[PDB]
Structures are given as C-alpha cells and as structure tokens.
Design a protein around this ligand. Structure first.
Ligand code: OAM
Length: 115
C-alpha cells in the first residue's frame, strides 16, 4: 500500500533469462511448427478459430523491442503458442505432439530459472 514497499524481487536479469529460454525453444528439434506465424491464408479455419495467433518469431520480436512489460507477459505469450496448438491440432498429430513436448520443455525451464 502507500509507502509500504513489499521487498523487491530482483528482475534485472529477466530479459536475458527469457531470451536464453526462448533461444532454447527456438533451437529445440520440435520447434518447427512454432517458428513462424501460422499462414492464415493457407490454413483453413485458423483465422476464425484462433483468436490470438502467436509464434516464436513474434515473441522474439516483442522481446527484442520492449513489448513485454514483465516476465509473466512473456510466459503468457509462450503458453498461448501451445494453447493455440492444442485447440487446433489433434494430440497425436505431429504438430499436436510437438506442442505438448515444447510446453513441457518450456515449463521446466520456467520453473528452474524463476521458481
Ligand atoms: C503451430 C501450428 N498449428 N497448426 C499449424 C498448421 C499449419 N498448417 N497446418 C496444416 C497446421 N495444422 N501450425 C503451424 C505449422 C507450420 N508448419 C508446417 C510445416 N512446417 C511448419
């Protein structure tokens, strides 16, 4: 509350640590479905169904251009990638499996780095 400061969790390395996590996501062998935006012209249903598309390249652009106010907004975008994937792809499809793998991969990194 006013003039009553809760102790300051050190966020000075968050940008660098998120960047390192994203690099590891980007270079994972199962990242291939998530590297670029889904092509909304060529993939039926996606534009109408997936209200907030997201992908690694877009996250990287946002991270590099100061568009994440904090680490939680970054993690929400990463999760959105995988939440979209689950909405659209069957769990045992290649892309659906890729998504489940990447989410697990992401969340261990997230917990280890920040929790
Ligand atoms: C991510 C994601 N979720 N669904 C798709 C997709 C794209 N095309 N099709 C038929 C899908 N189900 N994606 C992007 C996968 C983009 N891709 C395809 C081959 N290499 C990358």
């Amino acid at each position: 509350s006013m003039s009553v400061k809760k102790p300051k969790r050190d966020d000075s390395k968050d940008l660098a640590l998120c960047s390192m996590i994203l690099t590891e996501m980007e270079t994972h062998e199962d990242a291939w479905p998530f590297l670029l935006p889904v092509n909304l012209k060529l993939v039926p249903g996606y534009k109408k169904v997936i209200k907030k598309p997201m992908d690694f390249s877009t996250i990287r652009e946002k991270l590099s251009s100061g568009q994440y106010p904090n680490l939680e907004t970054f993690a929400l975008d990463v999760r959105l990638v995988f939440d979209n994937c689950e909405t659209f792809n069957e769990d045992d499809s290649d892309i659906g499996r890729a998504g489940h793998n990447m989410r697990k991969y992401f969340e261990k990194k997230w917990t280890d780095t920040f929790k």
